[PDB]
Amino acid sequence: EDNKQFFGRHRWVIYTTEMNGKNTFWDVDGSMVPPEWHRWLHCMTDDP
Amino acid sequence: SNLIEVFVDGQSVMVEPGTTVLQACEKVGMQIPRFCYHERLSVAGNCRMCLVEIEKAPKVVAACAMPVMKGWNILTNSEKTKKAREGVMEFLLANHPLDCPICDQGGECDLQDQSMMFGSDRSRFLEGKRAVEDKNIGPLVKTIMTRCIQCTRCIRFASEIAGVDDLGTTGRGNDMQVGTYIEKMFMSELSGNIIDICPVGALTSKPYAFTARPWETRKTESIDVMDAVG
Amino acid sequence: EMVRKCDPHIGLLHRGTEKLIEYKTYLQALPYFDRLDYVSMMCNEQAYSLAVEKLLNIQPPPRAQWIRVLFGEITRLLNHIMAVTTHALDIGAMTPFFWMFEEREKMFEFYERVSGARMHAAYVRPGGVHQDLPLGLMDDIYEFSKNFSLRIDELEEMLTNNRIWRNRTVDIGVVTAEDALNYGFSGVMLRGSGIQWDLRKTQPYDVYDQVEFDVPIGSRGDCYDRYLCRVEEMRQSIRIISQCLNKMPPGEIKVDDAKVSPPKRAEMKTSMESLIHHFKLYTEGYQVPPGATYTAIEAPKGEFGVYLVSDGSSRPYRCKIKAPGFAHLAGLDKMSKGHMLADVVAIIGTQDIVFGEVDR
Amino acid sequence: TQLITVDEKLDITTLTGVPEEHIKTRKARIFVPARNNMQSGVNNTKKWKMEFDTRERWENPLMGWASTADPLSNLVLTFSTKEDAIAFAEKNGWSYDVEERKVPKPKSKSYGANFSWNKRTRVSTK
Amino acid sequence: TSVKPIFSRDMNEAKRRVRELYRAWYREVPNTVHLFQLDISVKQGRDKVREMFKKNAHVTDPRVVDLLVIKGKMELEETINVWKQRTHVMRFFHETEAPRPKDFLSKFYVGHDP
Amino acid sequence: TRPTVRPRNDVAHKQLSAFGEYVAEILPKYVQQVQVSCFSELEICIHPDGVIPVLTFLRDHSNAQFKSLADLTAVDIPTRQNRFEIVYNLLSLRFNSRIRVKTYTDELTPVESSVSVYKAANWYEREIWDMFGVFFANHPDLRRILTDYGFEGHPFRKDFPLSGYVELRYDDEVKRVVAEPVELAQEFRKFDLNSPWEAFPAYRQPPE
Amino acid sequence: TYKYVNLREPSMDMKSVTDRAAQTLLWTELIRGLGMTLSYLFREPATINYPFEKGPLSPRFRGEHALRRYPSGEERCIACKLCEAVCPAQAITIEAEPRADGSRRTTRYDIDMTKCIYCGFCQEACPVDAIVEGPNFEFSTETHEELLYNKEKLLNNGDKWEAEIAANIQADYLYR
Amino acid sequence: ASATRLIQGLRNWASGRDLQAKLQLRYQEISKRTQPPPKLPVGPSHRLSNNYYCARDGRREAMPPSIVMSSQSEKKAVSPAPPIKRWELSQDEPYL
Amino acid sequence: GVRTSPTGEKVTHTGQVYDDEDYRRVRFVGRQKEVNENFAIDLIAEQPVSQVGSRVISCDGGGGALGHPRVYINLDKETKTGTCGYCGLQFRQQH
Amino acid sequence: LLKKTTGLVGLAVCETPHERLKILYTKILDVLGHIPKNAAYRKYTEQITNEKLSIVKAEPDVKKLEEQLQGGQIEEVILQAENELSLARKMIQWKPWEPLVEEPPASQWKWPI
Ligand code: SF4
Ligand code: SF4
Ligand code: SF4
Ligand code: SF4
Ligand code: FES
Ligand SMILES: [K+]
Ligand SMILES: [Zn+2]
């Protein structure tokens, strides 16, 4: 999180390099976020 | 001719002597709401939904059992008739269980349709509802007595048409229940017709249970071939 | 290089919408009007809702009336941004398209925060609105509209005094006042020709008679006057928005007739009369009394009317959709006579034509 | 006078655009719909309905859905009287059958008959 | 039984209009074959035109044949100008669909359709 | 009846009734019925042969001045011999009013085109043809406007099914988009939603 | 209540006409447009870094469909067929029968995701909050038949997205 | 809002406005994404007494259209409405 | 509580499985058959029956407005428990 | 006052409106002299034309003549007078004061069916 940025850039995620045995160093996916963090990342709430 | 002249909403109509108010209104084309009335059963007159106002008479009369008099003016759309219908709907829906999504009569329920048409749109009942123990009358009719409205079409059909005389009302007051009072099954050759005559989802078809819904079914008119009656 | 005849061929987006309406109930036919004019989504809901409520002899609650007008003016800002920036995009000024679409994205957040969908909300329903405004929504609307007058000025700086933009629009598509009425023109097409007419001022609906705004009137009937009228309508839409925020009343959002509008989910699961009404309204629907009516509102394109016929059942017998763009495209051949090939694409731009509503 | 006399029967089958397969091989049933026995209302038996025969519906190999090849399966037409339906069926060239309306016979109801003195119509209970 | 005519007072003017429409289509067919680059011959197209004309040749009401001539004229103007594509011209030639059974036995074998 | 019931407009009802009597008195040759609905809408049902004068009167009389043609519609009611009902909606900007003019035709009777009165109808009634088969005599350019070029039949007729009789797919053998008889993977489920109980006693029809 | 756009009479005196001549001889308004674009160059662009950053959404958002459960393992749907009766696109197909313990449960619940218009009528007509529109929107497939969800797929979606769907319902249900 | 003062001055000069007062990018001034729970009000028909539905039913008060003339003196000529009022020029900004 | 067919296919909670002679199994070759491993009947079987001291009981599924419509269950029969029609929870009178 | 523009595109400003309106109203009355008296159309439009002619004859000014004629500008009043003249000629051609030409069918205007 970085509250100094404007709305949209104030929260972000750096994806993992390996998820479920698939090498995701370059093949980052938008569906890799779990739902409990999917609520926080998409600005549905303030509380992580 | 011995016909007498009565009036429905100011419109004159000739009727035979002994005709009821409901039959005269059906003759002029108006269907009075009913729960316990059936044209092939004896008159009970207990649901009190058919209450209508006669002009210049300070008391509503049950149209299913009131014979017409000469010069009577029947007001089927008057204010106090609608008030009586709303009150009777409120009393009928006071103790009915919230079972419409899980009930097979949903979509073809007489109580639902007359509540939508002639009833009110909200409830003032802040108390708790009653619950009735379920009964077993065989593997043909699924029985949920909590949804019964004590219309007594069961006993009238089983006593006048089926000729079985095995159903009845046991108890008194709000605890009055329709049943056989013992572990007995209602097995006649015309038993399943009670599923047709129950206006609520108290008696449903056990093979048909939880399978379809009346709004999504296509109706094809055909002839039975199980016997030679046709 | 001149044009002597124009023959626009339509039917490439004829989905046959108004035949499918006859086989669906009044609630099910509501999202069909969202997809007619897909840049004026909540305005077409209001035209259909006002027609059904007229036949039902019911009226929306006062709070729902102010939400519909407030979101109607936000919808007018959505259409006028699209109708002007893409008009300049076809001409060649592609830069203000990207500036104003950032403001178009912020208003899409207002739709999705109140209804759940970014574009096709299905929010305005016969009897009021489906859901109330969430907490803190009107604070964000005030923050957006406070800075929006600067955004119109940046677009106005690029185009209004620019000599290249005027040369493409000064004497293109001049229509007279007498011929505009006979050709069925409406909205800015009448307004740009000097005819003083507006449906929100002459035949007002829900709370448009309680707000104050001005009606921009053109003087030459060309593409430039219709461009200036559309820009001025964005300024007047901000004026109504500030009045709607300060005059929003408390109360309910649906008509309290539970036989038309569904009850709350709290009382549906508690009282029996509400569960029966929730059962019948979402399966059969409310019965509309027999009759026919023609209800028209001032859509951002023009006059959007719906000729609705009911036969006493829970489904419409006939639902004719009158679109502003259907009559405007018929006059394309007349307006483009004697003009060049490149002047035609401005005339199809100076009439805000969405082919979802032209072909229906 | 600008009026001409045409005494031939109406026949618009060449103008409707329907293929002949759904013109000469279809049987149109004109009838008053029967009252649903689960309800006592009679408002659905006031108008005449004209419909067609039912053709084959089979199972989709993918999802088990009901697939059909009959376009006139969901066509139901409403007519005020029988003669309008007959004229519409003859105009469109559909071979049709019509069944007469069944009204209930007027019954004789008496509340006192439940308490007779010597008749079998006494009720065993009330 | 007195009705408002569309164009023809009797059957003679209607037959005259039918004759003009057939003449125009017979003149049109080679231009349609050459312009659209169809794979059919002029004989096939003219036989198709004659097939539709004989198929629709059992009517006796002047208004009906008047409307049929009107619709044929609309199709002729849609073919005169390049508004139809190759597909719309080849709609009359049903090549993709399998030929339906005609006798009783094959229809009995394939399904329940009468 | 205050909060949830739509208020009545009695002065508009009186004015519309007076103007309906005025129009029905000026033109007794063509008008057949004049009615005012409960929400103050004036309908003037006229003979089809007077579709040209009456509209012209409403376009040119100093007390009417219905200069705008808002809409033009056809309604298909199969139970009548004249199954097509043609509806003109007119708007008068001078007096700020709206009127409705209804005529009746069947499939074969032609209609005098109202292009010479209102130019917008030059497209509108043309669409009616493409949806209904109602022929408009003396039209400048009458053809299809919405359906496909090889389309047979008129879709908005109530005897036309929802899905048509043909549908398109690409065939690689002929390398072309071809039309075949329609075979739906899912049948359209028809729902019988009409309740068997009468809802509005005011619209009850007399029996037979 | 009306204003006259473009009805301005320009001054004919020497100063204003010389200003106009200097404007059309030295390109003043073109320089104004250039200055507008140059000033708009030095602003921070509003471009987010997808997929590392996501657009803002509300808990009313209608995305992928899911079938919920009670907090005991029992599924919420009791086969009442309200959602398939209210669905405007007829995307829902329901077939039901009583199961071994006698409960009213579905045996087939298909949603055609290529027919569905994502209108949320099913989740608002459900009396038990069984069917919901979840927050997921990144579920594009590579084959048409993958967008034909059956009961098992919707149950898997519900079990996958319950931890967010329950929170969204908790945050939103007071407005319903 | 992270720009230097030199770049801010350059933007203000080239644009012609003061852009720092009206920034299109949103910041901490917007509402919180989580809100306290609301308590919605009820309508006017949420009453226990004098709330009969027959006295507030809007659908049942709709009458069939009244027929003015049907085919089964010196009265003044009339109009559908009184003539419309001339629009007044705006006192706020008449653009004149 | 899933089970495995002798052809190697998993049986769903509705009892659906493809026969050995069915050709439709070719749609699963190279891919997987999607089944739900949480059976609702098995999961509701583990819930203990709640003992109450009244003739009738009221059930709404818990959570108030987040559950099912409220229903009333009679517990006069001592032989069997009173099961809720919506949530499947069962109750028993302790007397 | 020499009004600069009428504000309507394509509608030119008339130099002398009084004589033009008097000429149009007299022409309208002359045309209506051919319609039979018992026709209600002749009586009604004769009454309104006589009223408008009296107003335009008893008024020297232009602006308050416009404001009391209640017809917008005077140029659209002149246009409406010409339209009424053309309508009167067409009304003479059509003769719609005659009785009804045809009864409708029994249930032609019955809704709902
Ligand atoms: S009997 Fe009727 S009112 Fe009672 S639960 Fe069933 S559908 Fe509902
Ligand atoms: S179970 Fe049904 S038919 Fe029998 S008495 Fe009760 S309501 Fe009447
Ligand atoms: S969101 Fe709407 S279209 Fe989609 S399944 Fe639900 S009811 Fe049907
Ligand atoms: S509305 Fe809910 S409970 Fe009813 S069938 Fe649909 S998902 Fe199941
Ligand atoms: S129908 Fe008469 S009291 Fe029940
Ligand atoms: K029953
Ligand atoms: Zn429960």
Side-chain angles (χ1 to χ4, degrees), chain F residues 1-207:
Chain F
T1 67
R2 274 291 91 81
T4 65
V5 190
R6 173 191 176 95
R8 274 191 60 61
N9 208 337
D10 313 64
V11 48
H13 189 95
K14 282 176 39 74
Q15 287 166 358
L16 284 177
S17 298
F19 186 66
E21 264 181 352
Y22 176 83
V23 173
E25 189 180 26
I26 274 180
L27 311 146
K29 196 189 176 185
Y30 298 129
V31 307
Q32 313 188 329
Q33 198 142 291
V34 168
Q35 41 195 31
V36 181
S37 63
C38 67
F39 32 82
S40 299
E41 300 242 10
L42 178 55
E43 294 135 351
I44 302 187
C45 310
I46 75 179
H47 196 270
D49 293 348
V51 82
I52 277 288
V54 165
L55 289 181
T56 301
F57 175 78
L58 300 172
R59 218 260 324 272
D60 276 335
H61 195 51
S62 303
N63 288 123
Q65 303 190 23
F66 289 90
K67 299 283 212 275
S68 188
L69 172 67
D71 206 33
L72 180 38
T73 326
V75 184
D76 186 24
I77 315 115
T79 189
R80 312 174 190 178
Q81 22 172 357
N82 302 305
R83 59 184 286 190
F84 295 121
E85 177 155 303
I86 280 140
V87 167
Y88 296 85
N89 293 98
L90 313 178
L91 164 71
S92 171
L93 279 86
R94 174 70 51 207
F95 298 102
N96 196 351
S97 296
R98 289 180 187 274
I99 214 166
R100 193 171 312 137
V101 173
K102 308 200 261 211
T103 87
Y104 57 97
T105 88
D106 62 334
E107 313 99 340
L108 298 183
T109 320
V111 187
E112 311 76 10
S113 186
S114 98
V115 169
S116 59
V117 195
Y118 299 103
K119 289 285 180 290
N122 174 296
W123 263 27
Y124 265 110
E125 70 215 356
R126 168 170 146 194
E127 154 173 11
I128 282 185
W129 158 262
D130 202 11
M131 301 335 297
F132 290 93
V134 175
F135 186 65
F136 286 96
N138 295 351
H139 201 273
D141 191 15
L142 196 61
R143 39 200 180 82
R144 56 166 32 90
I145 205 187
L146 286 177
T147 47
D148 209 359
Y149 284 103
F151 202 81
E152 275 201 334
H154 304 287
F156 279 3
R157 295 192 183 184
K158 280 212 164 292
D159 45 287
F160 200 89
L162 188 58
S163 302
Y165 299 104
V166 289
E167 77 171 28
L168 302 198
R169 71 164 192 89
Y170 179 76
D171 199 70
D172 201 89
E173 162 208 352
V174 282
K175 298 280 193 290
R176 210 171 57 240
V177 181
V178 295
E180 290 181 356
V182 49
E183 291 202 6
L184 290 160
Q186 180 143 336
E187 199 198 19
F188 177 67
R189 283 162 285 164
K190 174 207 60 141
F191 286 167
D192 276 328
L193 300 171
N194 261 113
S195 176
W197 284 94
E198 174 189 1
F200 314 113
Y203 295 91
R204 182 182 301 125
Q205 318 206 269

Side-chain angles (χ1 to χ4, degrees), chain B residues 18-213:
Chain B
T19 317
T20 66
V21 176
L22 193 134
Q23 283 178 343
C25 292
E26 258 151 22
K27 279 178 65 63
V28 80
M30 198 267 162
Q31 180 165 47
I32 303 201
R34 77 217 47 182
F35 281 107
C36 62
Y37 184 75
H38 202 278
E39 60 177 357
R40 313 199 192 278
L41 298 174
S42 58
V43 179
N46 47 20
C47 88
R48 314 305 283 187
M49 191 85 188
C50 76
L51 291 177
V52 86
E53 170 199 356
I54 309 298
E55 180 180 60
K56 297 194 277 315
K59 198 170 178 183
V60 285
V61 293
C64 79
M66 199 39 159
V68 294
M69 280 285 144
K70 183 179 187 297
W72 263 12
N73 194 4
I74 306 151
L75 307 181
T76 70
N77 210 42
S78 65
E79 193 218 353
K80 78 190 290 188
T81 304
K82 292 189 285 187
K83 278 189 186 293
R85 287 171 190 172
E86 284 182 11
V88 168
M89 200 45 68
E90 201 165 15
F91 285 141
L92 269 161
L93 292 179
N95 269 316
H96 209 88
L98 266 81
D99 273 338
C100 294
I102 55 171
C103 165
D104 279 323
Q105 211 68 28
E108 54 190 359
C109 182
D110 255 332
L111 177 64
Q112 268 184 352
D113 277 357
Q114 307 170 69
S115 167
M116 274 303 268
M117 289 318 150
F118 312 100
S120 179
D121 53 342
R122 50 209 54 206
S123 183
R124 306 179 298 188
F125 196 76
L126 309 179
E127 324 295 324
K129 304 172 184 288
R130 73 168 161 176
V132 191
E133 162 195 347
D134 297 337
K135 276 88 168 182
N136 199 9
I137 48 177
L140 281 180
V141 180
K142 162 134 72 42
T143 280
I144 309 284
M145 291 324 317
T146 315
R147 306 165 187 167
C148 173
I149 55 176
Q150 282 86 18
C151 91
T152 72
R153 278 193 208 171
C154 276
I155 318 85
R156 286 184 275 153
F157 185 80
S159 177
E160 303 158 19
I161 299 181
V164 183
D165 263 314
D166 271 342
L167 286 168
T169 42
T170 65
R172 206 169 66 183
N174 213 353
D175 272 327
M176 202 184 63
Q177 307 182 2
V178 179
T180 61
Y181 182 69
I182 41 175
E183 201 56 20
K184 195 167 179 57
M185 59 190 22
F186 177 64
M187 291 265 147
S188 173
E189 77 273 3
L190 301 166
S191 69
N193 291 306
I194 70 187
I195 311 163
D196 284 329
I197 74 168
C198 187
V200 291
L203 310 176
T204 44
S205 169
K206 197 183 252 82
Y208 187 62
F210 314 143
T211 50
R213 209 57 137 182

Side-chain angles (χ1 to χ4, degrees), chain C residues 306-319:
Chain C
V306 174
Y307 180 67
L308 191 67
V309 188
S310 65
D311 54 345
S313 67
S314 64
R315 283 177 270 191
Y317 192 81
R318 174 89 173 100
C319 183

Side-chain angles (χ1 to χ4, degrees), chain G residues 110-172:
Chain G
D110 321 330
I111 290 182
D112 198 28
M113 302 285 297
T114 65
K115 271 176 206 163
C116 162
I117 69 179
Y118 297 83
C119 78
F121 284 174
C122 44
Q123 75 168 357
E124 90 183 21
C126 192
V128 291
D129 321 330
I131 182 77
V132 281
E133 290 217 61
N136 190 21
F137 55 91
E138 292 144 339
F139 63 110
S140 99
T141 87
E142 307 187 9
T143 313
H144 191 179
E145 30 264 53
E146 304 190 23
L147 281 173
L148 269 74
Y149 289 174
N150 52 52
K151 170 139 193 238
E152 316 287 332
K153 171 72 172 184
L154 295 167
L155 278 179
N156 275 323
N157 268 2
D159 297 14
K160 178 177 164 185
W161 293 94
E162 180 70 32
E164 184 164 20
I165 282 177
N168 284 1
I169 292 206
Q170 176 66 228
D172 185 58

Side-chain angles (χ1 to χ4, degrees), chain J residues 25-66:
Chain J
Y25 287 152
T26 326
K27 273 165 111 204
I28 283 161
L29 287 184
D30 162 26
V31 164
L32 291 165
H34 301 155
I35 306 198
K37 312 140 301 310
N38 45 1
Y41 164 69
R42 167 181 169 171
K43 288 146 133 151
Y44 288 147
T45 190
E46 204 144 279
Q47 169 207 328
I48 65 135
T49 312
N50 267 321
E51 278 180 350
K52 284 161 146 115
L53 187 53
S54 278
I55 308 206
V56 85
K57 255 203 187 295
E59 197 100 331
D61 211 1
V62 173
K63 257 73 189 169
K64 45 83 145 162
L65 172 65
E66 281 180 347

